[PDB]
């Protein structure tokens, strides 16, 4: 579990979105596992606007933050689940690091701000859904 709160927005993994998220839907993309809903209270998360390939992510399954090197956002194959059929997930970044289902929603950050959230993982790898291209989250 986990979300990004920037201004009047809440960014969550689309497969973990609530009924309230869908009733206050702004934008969603199955191919990226993202859903953005509107909020009444103000959010203060700063979104990074950069091409950083190093950062720190929160791992709930370990109650620890870990430094990582991660790849550039790309289309990566992801296996089937109770949420999606087998497909290519776009805007996805992989890092060598620990993750387990339950870790989705953990924030990845660089010195510039929020880079994205945990969305996939397995076999010593962790995948992050990038949010840096969503320029409209700030305006
Ligand atoms: N974006 C998707 O299609 C997801 C949907 C939920 C299930 N997915 C996983 O990757 C499970 C998983 C296993 C093992 C470490 C994991 N860390 O985070 N998620 C992990 C795929
Ligand atoms: Zn950065």
From Swiss-Prot:
> Which residues act catalytically here?
15 (for protease 2a activity), 33 (for protease 2a activity), 104 (for protease 2a activity)
Question: Which amino acids does the record list as binding Zn(2+) 1?
Answer: 50, 52, 110, 112
- Catalytic activities: Selective cleavage of Tyr-|-Gly bond in the picornavirus polyprotein
Record field: transmembrane: none
Q: What is the purpose of this protein? A: Cysteine protease that cleaves viral polyprotein and specific host proteins. It is responsible for the autocatalytic cleavage between the P1 and P2 regions, which is the first cleavage occurring in the polyprotein. Also cleaves the host translation initiation factor EIF4G1, in order to shut down the capped cellular mRNA translation. Inhibits the host nucleus-cytoplasm protein and RNA trafficking by cleaving host members of the nuclear pores. Counteracts stress granule formation probably by antagonizing its assembly or promoting its dissassembly.
Quaternary structure, from the entry: Homodimer.
Official protein name in the record = Protease 2A
Query: Which part of the full protein does this chain span, and how long is the full protein?
Result: 869 to 1007 of 2193
């Amino acid at each position: 579990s986990g979300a990004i709160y920037v201004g009047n927005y809440r960014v969550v993994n689309r497969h973990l979105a609530t009924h309230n998220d869908w009733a206050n839907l702004v934008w969603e993309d199955s191919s990226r596992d993202l859903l953005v809903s509107s909020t009444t209270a103000q959010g203060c998360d700063t979104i990074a606007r950069c091409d950083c390939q190093t950062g720190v992510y929160y791992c709930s399954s370990r109650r620890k933050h870990y430094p990582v090197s991660f790849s550039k956002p790309s289309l990566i194959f992801v296996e089937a689940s109770e949420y999606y059929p087998a497909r290519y997930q776009s805007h996805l970044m992989l890092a060598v690091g620990h993750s387990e289902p339950g870790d989705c929603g953990g924030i990845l950050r660089c010195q510039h701000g929020v880079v994205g959230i945990v969305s996939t993982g397995g076999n010593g790898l962790v995948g992050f859904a990038d949010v840096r291209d969503l320029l409209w989250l700030d305006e």
